[PDB]
């Protein structure tokens, strides 16, 4: 019925934006990780650590939205 139109439409718009957020949000981060390494690469293993520390925070909301989108698409059908 009509539901199974929009139940997919929503799942798209939620998971599409959740992509634009997660990708760009990390890229802006990753760039600053590289330009620092490209000056004094001796700190690569140090900075990489901090990188993950902060990247986990970036994927806080995007992965929540992806989870809700998967719930809407599969469980709610």
């Amino acid at each position: 019925n009509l539901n199974m139109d929009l139940l997919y439409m929503a799942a798209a718009v939620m998971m599409g934006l959740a992509a634009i957020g997660a990708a760009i949000g990390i890229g802006i981060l990753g760039g600053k990780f590289l330009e620092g390494a490209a000056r004094q690469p001796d700190l690569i293993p140090l900075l990489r650590t901090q990188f993950f520390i902060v990247m986990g925070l970036v994927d806080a909301i995007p992965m929540i939205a992806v989870g809700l989108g998967l719930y809407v698409m599969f469980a709610v059908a």
């Binding site: 490209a38 000056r39 004094q40 690469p41 001796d42």
Partner: protein, 57 residues
């Protein structure tokens, strides 16, 4: 050139164009300065100040 306490020799030496460094800073590979503000306007001042010391010397 002051060489010994009883031996001094007149020398003509080249300051600019800059003479060629015997050493290689390929070993400085592994690091680069965080040039503030910007490297070219800074190298200009470095070179001017360097000829001055060598003259003073």
């Amino acid at each position: 050139k002051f060489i010994n306490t009883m031996s001094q020799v007149p020398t003509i030496s080249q300051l600019l164009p800059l003479p060629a460094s015997d050493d290689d800073d390929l070993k400085h590979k592994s690091w680069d300065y965080l040039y503030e503000p910007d490297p070219k306007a800074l190298l200009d001042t470095l070179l001017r100040r360097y000829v001055e010391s060598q003259v003073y010397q």
